[PDB]
Amino acid sequence: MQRGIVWVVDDDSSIRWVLERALAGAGLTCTTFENGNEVLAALASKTPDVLLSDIRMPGMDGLALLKQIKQRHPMLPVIIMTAHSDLDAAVSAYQQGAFDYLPKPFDIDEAVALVERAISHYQE
Numbered sequence: 001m002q003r004g005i006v007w008v009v010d011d012d013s014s015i016r017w018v019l020e021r022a023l024a025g026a027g028l029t030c031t032t033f034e035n036g037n038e039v040l041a042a043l044a045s046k047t048p049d050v051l052l053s054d055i056r057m058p059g060m061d062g063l064a065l066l067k068q069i070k071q072r073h074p075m076l077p078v079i080i081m082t083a084h085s086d087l088d089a090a091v092s093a094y095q096q097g098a099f100d101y102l103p104k105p106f107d108i109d110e111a112v113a114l115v116e117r118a119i120s121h122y123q124e
């Protein structure tokens with residue numbers, strides 16, 4: 001039993017406002033960060049029920065973030081907004097406890113329609 005904690009990383013100010021407001025309606029604490037590293041820092045003192053991160057900056061495009069997540073977070077449900085290169089890092093993400101790899105489409109319909117089933121498929 002948790003109080004729904006969803007963490008996202010993409011743009012922030014724009015994606016956040018939409019997600020922080022929409023996700024909160026369902027009954028979960030939604031928060032955003034720079035792209036993924038910040039989360040790796042904040043995550044050090046708190047693990048969210050579900051997490052979302054971009055994939056265009058880290059040495060390994062984006063999946064690199066997963067490589068970091070799985071270093072401090074044994075099994076953290078991390079979802080990505082895109083899968084352009086280094087797909088092998090994505091496969092390794094599922095191995096540690098990553099949800100899936102979704103296309104750039106995020107806003108709310110796509111982002112939420114996925115985050116929900118994510119927790120739904122985990123809460124039994």
Ligand code: BEF
Pocket residue numbers: 054055056062081082083104
């Ligand atoms: F790298 Be993100 F998907 F724009």
